[PDB]
């Protein structure tokens with residue numbers, strides 16, 4: 001019975017620091033390069049985490065890289081909102097212990113409205129009173145929530161895995177159980193429009209980066225110019241539970 005949860009809680013990654021120098025005055029270039037660095041850092045964890053998920057290693061290996069590459073934004077954002085919820089009560093954006101966005105940093109990052117949506121996301125955990133177990137299952141399901149419209153190499157395996165994760169979440173929930181399931185499914189869905197705003201933003205930023213003194217690490221640069229445009233151009237689409 002508690003085997004699946006045991007794994008989720010066991011493999012949950014720990015604190016990742018951004019490397020940000022809070023002594024330097026908040027500037028758009030500084031704030032954004034630190035996010036990029038954080039992103040690159042958190043990426044390593046996401047890989048090791050994902051490969052340690054129950055059933056994940058039996059996806060086709062190409063599909064293993066692909067789904068990680070399409071879903072990191074949504075994963076990292078959903079986690080951050082959780083950190084923000086548990087650490088600063090959704091009042092600020094707790095990207096890392098060494099990189100917390102107050103109101104001022106939200107403005108300086110030129111990402112204000114996105115940050116507002118992300119804060120809203122964070123406030124939801126409070127609103128819905130999400131248990132940590134619910135959070136871990138939802139976060140794992142997020143990794144199977146976005147795919148090419150033309151299918152993966154072994155779609156069959158993907159579909160079975162995804163179904164198992166959905167039934168895992170149901171179990172963790174269980175009128176009361178019906179309403180509840182609807183809520184987390186709508187909450188999970190709400191992650192995708194936010195991920196997309198961030199995909200749009202980071203892509204525009206990459207294009208004009210040499211122009212605005214904002215550095216991108218190798219893996220971020222690679223992914224944002226090869227994988228993210230597939231999402232933007234509509235070759236990769238998220239899987240929503242409810243019709244938008």
Ligand SMILES: C[C@]12CC[C@H]3[C@@H](CCC4=CC(=O)CC[C@@]43C)[C@@H]1CC[C@@H]2O
Nearest residue numbers: 035036038039042076077080095198202
């Ligand atoms: C993509 C990004 C750098 C990586 C950030 C991302 C915002 C969302 C986010 C939350 C995290 O906790 C990890 C870093 C990431 C993934 C940043 C938005 C603009 C910047 O380029």
Ligand SMILES: c1ccc(OCCSc2nc3ccccc3[nH]2)cc1
Nearest residue numbers: 003004054055058160161164165168
């Ligand atoms: C191929 C496809 C999926 C696979 O597992 C998906 C993990 S879901 C799951 N939840 C469980 C809960 C209890 C016991 C076993 C469980 N398996 C394994 C091989």
